[PDB]
Amino acid sequence: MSEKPLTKTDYLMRLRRCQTIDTLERVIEKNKYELSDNELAVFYSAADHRLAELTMNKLYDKIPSSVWKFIR
């Protein structure tokens, strides 16, 4: 809507659509090389938010520095 690659929510929303992390992770690698640096920025930023909640169970957007520092 605002940008060709869409917003972090556009990709992020489709990212969670996956069935599992193990399989979804496989697509992260392919998608990373699939699109370009422009859409990837949205794919990377979205993959982190998901990864964040994975560590906090189901909490994202409010991930502190301590929690993030733990998970890489």
Side-chain angles (χ1 to χ4, degrees), residues 1-15 31 35-46:
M1 283 146 134
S2 184
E3 197 118 76
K4 280 179 221 265
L6 311 102
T7 11
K8 314 210 173 237
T9 184
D10 297 36
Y11 258 44
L12 174 62
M13 287 257 57
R14 245 119 158 178
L15 244 173
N31 216 306
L35 78 223
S36 267
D37 279 275
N38 189 23
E39 349 296 311
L40 182 139
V42 191
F43 196 97
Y44 214 112
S45 65

Side-chain angles (χ1 to χ4, degrees), residues 9 32 41 46 52 55 65 67:
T9 184
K32 271 246 259 78
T55 303
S65 62
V67 185

Side-chain angles (χ1 to χ4, degrees), residues 3-71:
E3 197 118 76
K4 280 179 221 265
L6 311 102
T7 11
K8 314 210 173 237
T9 184
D10 297 36
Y11 258 44
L12 174 62
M13 287 257 57
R14 245 119 158 178
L15 244 173
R16 57 179 300 186
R17 232 199 162 71
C18 64
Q19 54 154 297
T20 175
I21 306 303
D22 265 54
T23 267
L24 171 279
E25 196 228 286
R26 191 194 117 161
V27 75
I28 308 184
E29 231 303 318
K30 244 235 258 251
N31 216 306
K32 271 246 259 78
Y33 272 126
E34 226 206 60
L35 78 223
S36 267
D37 279 275
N38 189 23
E39 349 296 311
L40 182 139
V42 191
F43 196 97
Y44 214 112
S45 65
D48 265 348
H49 251 212
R50 216 93 264 161
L51 149 285
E53 50 173 75
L54 261 85
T55 303
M56 219 87 94
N57 315 357
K58 274 265 71 147
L59 176 281
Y60 85 81
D61 208 26
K62 284 91 95 143
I63 310 112
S65 62
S66 274
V67 185
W68 238 124
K69 257 131 151 73
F70 220 101
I71 188 132

